[PDB]
């Protein structure tokens, strides 16, 4: 059974969450995310609590709970000159940071250095700080899927989701792409996304990233589908953040925004009979009174 | 006056053109760097708690020719762009609001903060700058919040003596923050401090004010405090509903102090630029 079937739909039902990651990263990303929710077809998003523009996004989230909002759990900081670290004091989670007190750039350095106990404390602290600011998250997911950097970290992530009775992002392809050669028999109690779609560099470098998203909607099949995007205006802030990092860089993020506010994308939902869903709806199916 | 106590004649027009709030924002970092490179701005200071500190720090550690200090930060004036202490909140709890960010106003800081927490956090900001490779030549004070209470000013003066750095002390700044000169006999007092004012900004005359300041400048140690930044989306987002020293104002600062007009006024008035590093060297030599 695909996940649509597990959620009580027919097997051919094309369920879709159109999900903006990295809200809170930057002012341009906050503004583009908000406008893509209000004026486009994006219907869900998640927030990086450690990041410098978290407060602005937390104010929007607390006052606009109709948009499915989650916590984008953060244990890495991929940018060259724009650096951030944990919510908790460094002395409480010292295995998670480089010599400057910032998160490492790569999953493998996190796997090499981080202690599971520190991961668990810091991810719990990001969720708790979201709650303290009045956010009412409906899901948790993982920036650069760094929770998959070690099986022990994925297990911390699964336990934290159960503790807060929230759904989380799990998917066989994400597992493989972070080098996690697990077996799905351990996931009987969990809901796995059938298909996760995100932009790829080989389309971006042909100038065809927009065409990639059109093709993804054209070819969607029954099951639970998740599109992950990063809408942000390609202005000087974003160029400053994504310097020397064109993969999911500032030009790419603007393409995300434009595609998912277009008439083209909106018509494709209807033409392909795609059924939008949010994590809160999934949460309510899984966690009963 | 300070010009004589630094070894010059009384009529000498010493001037520091000093960019505050470096580290605040990417747009301010870029505008500050460009004004040092291509303007007549000759000094700046860095806000260590701010989100764009690291990028500024990389510039500072590899570009020591530019006089550079630590802009000590105990307040966060902005509506949606919030930052707090370098130290953990549990270690300096009296410095922060319920969100863990610095307060917006010196008055709240003075009502709440313990001088002990002030001393610990200001020390941590200087130490973090040092750890990142910055070799500061001076300290000064964001919104002059070290003047919010006399005990805070004393902390600030002790910290300057401990690191053997010059610091910004001035009677106009004192009376701005609401705070007797004979107590400062072994410290160097700036004779005149110039900063933009809203009454001129709202009439479209901010640059006129700076031009008049250069034309009229008198002998002694003069200090112009500015905040160059590009008036772009990022700065509009930081300075929303805060036009005083807001994004358009900061663009005027950049435009004027990279203009040939300003450089010409320097030549016409025979104003002599000087840095805090030179002042520190001269104090140490005395
Ligand atoms: Ni992410
Ligand atoms: Ni300042």
């Amino acid at each position: 059974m695909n996940a649509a079937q597990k959620l009580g739909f027919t097997e051919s039902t094309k369920l879709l969450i159109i999900h903006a990651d990295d809200a809170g990263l930057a002012h341009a990303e906050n503004r583009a995310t908000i406008q893509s929710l209000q004026k486009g077809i994006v219907n869900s998003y998640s927030i990086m609590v450690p990041c410098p523009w978290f407060y602005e996004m937390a104010i929007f989230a607390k006052n606009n709970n109709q948009y499915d909002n989650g916590v984008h759990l953060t244990l890495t900081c991929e940018w060259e000159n724009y650096r951030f670290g944990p919510v908790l004091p460094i002395s409480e989670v010292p295995s998670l940071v480089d010599e400057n007190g910032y998160f490492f750039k790569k999953r493998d350095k996190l796997a090499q250095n981080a202690k599971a106990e520190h991961v668990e404390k810091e991810l719990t602290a990001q969720i708790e700080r979201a709650l303290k600011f009045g956010i009412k998250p409906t899901h948790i997911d993982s920036h650069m899927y760094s929770v998959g950097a070690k099986p022990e970290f994925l297990n911390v992530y699964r336990r934290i989701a159960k503790k807060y009775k929230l759904p989380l992002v799990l998917n066989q392809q994400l597992f493989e792409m972070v080098g996690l050669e697990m077996d799905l028999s351990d996931f009987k109690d969990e809901l796995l996304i059938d298909n996760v779609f995100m932009g790829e560099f080989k389309y971006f470098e042909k100038g065809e990233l927009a065409n990639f998203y059109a093709t993804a909607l054209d070819k969607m099949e029954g099951g639970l589908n998740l599109i992950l995007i990063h809408p942000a205006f390609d202005d000087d802030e974003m160029k400053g953040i994504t310097i020397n990092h064109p993969n999911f860089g500032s030009e790419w993020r603007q393409i995300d925004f434009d595609f998912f506010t277009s008439e083209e994308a909106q018509s494709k939902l209807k033409e392909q009979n795609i059924q939008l869903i949010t994590w809160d709806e999934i949460r309510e199916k899984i966690y009963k009174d």
Side-chain angles (χ1 to χ4, degrees), chain A:
Chain A
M1 314 204 282
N2 68 35
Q5 296 172 271
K6 295 167 154 13
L7 289 169
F9 305 88
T10 67
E11 175 205 322
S12 63
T13 298
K14 310 176 194 183
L15 301 174
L16 178 60
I17 307 169
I18 302 181
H19 184 281
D21 288 352
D22 295 17
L25 174 68
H27 180 57
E29 185 128 12
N30 290 352
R31 285 209 307 140
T33 296
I34 295 171
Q35 283 177 35
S36 77
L37 290 161
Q38 296 171 331
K39 281 30 208 183
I41 63 167
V42 179
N43 74 338
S44 190
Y45 69 104
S46 64
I47 303 169
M48 311 180 56
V49 177
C51 282
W53 282 91
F54 161 69
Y55 181 80
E56 180 178 54
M57 195 71 218
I59 296 307
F60 174 86
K62 183 206 163 113
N63 290 317
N64 297 273
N65 279 313
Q66 69 269 26
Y67 305 109
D68 196 62
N69 57 105
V71 179
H72 193 50
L73 298 165
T74 297
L75 300 166
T76 46
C77 175
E78 63 268 36
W79 309 117
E80 163 168 343
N81 293 329
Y82 186 59
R83 312 282 307 149
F84 38 84
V87 168
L88 290 176
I90 290 331
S91 74
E92 184 172 355
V93 291
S95 64
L96 307 186
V97 294
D98 67 21
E99 58 182 339
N100 301 325
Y102 303 125
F103 289 130
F104 301 114
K105 299 190 184 182
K106 310 239 172 244
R107 280 187 313 266
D108 50 359
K109 197 79 190 113
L110 178 82
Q112 281 174 3
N113 296 103
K115 302 302 154 223
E117 273 100 345
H118 297 170
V119 171
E120 193 157 20
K121 288 168 128 53
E122 170 61 20
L123 299 183
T124 301
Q126 288 174 30
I127 293 167
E128 285 296 328
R129 177 154 177 90
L131 298 167
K132 176 181 139 231
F133 276 70
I135 305 167
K136 288 155 180 150
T138 67
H139 60 287
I140 64 181
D141 56 29
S142 172
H143 179 64
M144 301 172 14
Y145 217 62
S146 56
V147 298
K150 269 207 136 213
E152 205 176 1
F153 300 172
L154 197 75
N155 291 343
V156 164
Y157 172 65
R158 294 164 60 188
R159 284 201 298 280
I160 287 172
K162 301 205 163 62
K163 180 202 188 169
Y164 291 91
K165 294 190 176 71
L166 296 181
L168 75 178
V169 168
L170 301 164
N171 164 268
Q172 302 85 321
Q173 303 120 48
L174 292 171
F175 295 169
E176 297 165 349
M177 157 202 322
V178 302
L180 205 52
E181 293 317 326
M182 291 208 18
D183 178 284
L184 295 325
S185 70
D186 198 44
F187 288 93
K188 296 191 216 94
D189 57 328
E190 314 260 20
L191 187 72
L192 261 63
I193 298 145
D194 295 292
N195 291 103
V196 175
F197 295 86
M198 49 184 61
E200 295 169 35
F201 200 77
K202 66 188 169 176
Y203 305 97
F204 172 75
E205 68 183 345
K206 293 191 71 67
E208 276 161 4
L209 176 61
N211 304 73
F212 170 84
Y213 294 129
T215 305
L217 295 170
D218 284 341
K219 296 207 291 250
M220 221 151 262
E221 322 214 275
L224 183 52
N225 299 283
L226 173 67
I227 285 169
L228 295 177
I229 52 171
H230 306 81
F233 301 122
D234 182 15
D235 62 13
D236 291 326
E237 182 197 17
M238 274 338 270
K239 283 167 169 75
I241 296 179
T242 66
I243 178 77
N244 298 325
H245 194 299
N247 191 222
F248 301 88
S250 64
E251 173 186 358
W252 178 308
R253 288 191 194 233
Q254 174 77 51
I255 293 167
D256 287 8
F257 170 78
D258 283 312
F259 184 90
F260 287 93
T261 51
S262 67
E263 183 273 339
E264 173 193 10
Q266 168 183 79
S267 306
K268 269 175 197 300
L269 298 178
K270 302 134 181 264
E271 297 174 345
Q272 294 304 329
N273 187 36
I274 292 160
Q275 293 179 43
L276 294 175
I277 192 166
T278 59
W279 285 110
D280 219 29
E281 182 182 330
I282 296 167
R283 172 188 180 185
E284 295 149 17
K285 279 172 179 295
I286 287 175
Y287 290 105
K288 293 316 223 183
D289 188 326

